[PDB]
Design a protein around this ligand. Sequence first.
Ligand SMILES: O=S1(=O)NCN(C2CC2)c2ccc(F)cc21
Ligand SMILES: O=S1(=O)NCN(C2CC2)c2ccc(F)cc21
Ligand SMILES: N[C@@H](CCC(=O)O)C(=O)O
Ligand SMILES: N[C@@H](CCC(=O)O)C(=O)O
Ligand SMILES: C[As](C)(=O)[O-]
Ligand SMILES: C[As](C)(=O)[O-]
Ligand SMILES: [Zn+2]
Ligand SMILES: [Zn+2]
Ligand SMILES: [Zn+2]
Ligand SMILES: [Zn+2]
Ligand SMILES: [Zn+2]
Ligand SMILES: [Zn+2]
Ligand SMILES: [Zn+2]
Ligand SMILES: [Zn+2]
Lengths: 262, 262
Amino acid sequence: GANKTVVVTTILESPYVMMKKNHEMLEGNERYEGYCVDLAAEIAKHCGFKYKLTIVGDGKYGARDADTKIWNGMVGELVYGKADIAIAPLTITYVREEVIDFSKPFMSLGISIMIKKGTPIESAEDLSKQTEIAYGTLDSGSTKEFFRRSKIAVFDKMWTYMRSAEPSVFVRTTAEGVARVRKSKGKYAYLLESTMNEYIEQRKPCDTMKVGGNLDSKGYGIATPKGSSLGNAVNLAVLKLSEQGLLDKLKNKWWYDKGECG
Amino acid sequence: GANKTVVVTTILESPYVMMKKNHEMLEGNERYEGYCVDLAAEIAKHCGFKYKLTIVGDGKYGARDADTKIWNGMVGELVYGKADIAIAPLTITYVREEVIDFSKPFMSLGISIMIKKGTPIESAEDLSKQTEIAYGTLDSGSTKEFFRRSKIAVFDKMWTYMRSAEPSVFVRTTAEGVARVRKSKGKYAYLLESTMNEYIEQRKPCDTMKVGGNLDSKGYGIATPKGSSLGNAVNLAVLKLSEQGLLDKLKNKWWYDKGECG
Ligand SMILES: O=S1(=O)NCN(C2CC2)c2ccc(F)cc21
Ligand SMILES: O=S1(=O)NCN(C2CC2)c2ccc(F)cc21
Ligand SMILES: N[C@@H](CCC(=O)O)C(=O)O
Ligand SMILES: N[C@@H](CCC(=O)O)C(=O)O
Ligand SMILES: C[As](C)(=O)[O-]
Ligand SMILES: C[As](C)(=O)[O-]
Ligand SMILES: [Zn+2]
Ligand SMILES: [Zn+2]
Ligand SMILES: [Zn+2]
Ligand SMILES: [Zn+2]
Ligand SMILES: [Zn+2]
Ligand SMILES: [Zn+2]
Ligand SMILES: [Zn+2]
Ligand SMILES: [Zn+2]
């Protein structure tokens, strides 16, 4: 077929994709800036395609509803033919790789703990042995599903608490989780990916920090519909960008060169 | 076809695959122990195949000779039909993924610097700005090819030195590189993957250490011939083992539970 503009689904999540100040009424890709915006430009160049950045309609990463068996978020957009590719902080997981294809990882992360500075918590075990400090995760993402499915003793115990805690410990966006930590006086800790944690740790008002080691080890990958023609080239482009050091360069650019806390 | 015993190519590299003490004259898989030995057992179970561990004939990981264009090592064994699968500390690289398939990574690593304790070196930049301390890498592996192909200023400079240094700074096995560090009185530093570096750092006589950060970020994957029937199932099994925490468990088992330096 004739070359067609590739539809990219992505999500407003700092510093991966952000609306440039005062660009709301402009058009096309120029509106957006961030790590995944730069990455999408590089992938498209190496693979020889034109593309259109679109923000996922429901604002979600992607999970399969236990009732309807329907995939939501960016995963859903790929599964149901609404997008050709997802270029986003989308976590590689077993259940997702059954239904979509992931490139090799372009960024590593693990689930980590965000506290307000001074909170007397150092580890997941610390969280699980007390009741004074509440803790939760993002909705419809891999962190929540990790805890839901884990047989690891401490994580199972944490899930047992989180899934029935009232009011809900879950949040709709990373921004909401961070705000909840910052306004909790130390009484809420947020479980999120180390990448996002370390980004926020470098943002004013510099009142949060990542504590303890990561709970797991995984990565983000570029995702395409199962058996898509783009998969092979996209996979090779990620590995080329990795070996060239461009992925390291983009991370320093968006995390640390832009650091506001020293 | 009828189920057939899968031929696994792997390499004698501690602590991934090691000959059990006094097992030289025994038979089959029971001879061997190590991280990749345990991993192979798990992968085979999840994928439903029987297998035979074989050690790569030429003792190499794999590189394509610039003259003959022929692949050696474990990569060669897959490319030329001598093995069905490689389960080994085999690094995911662009040039390799062009010719073989890799699962998602089962272990992360980066190129790192091994010094004899007390060596006045802290970084790759340190190495590249002096001449007193020699430094090299393993032959026919990803570390050497990384330096050969790098356009990054410091790494390019290091390669320019290493490729013409006499006597050769390159070694045939990790064991040889480590021995060279230990007998150099600090006058040789070895560039190797962080995984192997951190393993040796925990081995008697506890006279080496990893210094500085990693030079790059990548992983080992399980490799199969291009378009092999095993690829999909193997890929999903790695991600399942990852999410179950078994990969973390195996690393602690072979690196740190077995630690000899405290
Ligand atoms: O989600 S993965 O493809 N498989 C799991 N791993 C862990 C090294 C086992 C990692 C580690 C770093 C990544 F970037 C991705 C992954
Ligand atoms: O060789 S990969 O498949 N692609 C490169 N990455 C880096 C996160 C960019 C990583 C990071 C951790 C891995 F385990 C594998 C890989
Ligand atoms: N990266 C996650 C979203 C963030 C989280 O769940 O912590 C996903 O792909 O679902
Ligand atoms: N893991 C490497 C070998 C070790 C090294 O090159 O440092 C490879 O797959 O080639
Ligand atoms: C249904 As609820 C435990 O997220 O408030
Ligand atoms: C041919 As040489 C530089 O490895 O001695
Ligand atoms: Zn603009
Ligand atoms: Zn490029
Ligand atoms: Zn449970
Ligand atoms: Zn809920
Ligand atoms: Zn025995
Ligand atoms: Zn298992
Ligand atoms: Zn050069
Ligand atoms: Zn040589």
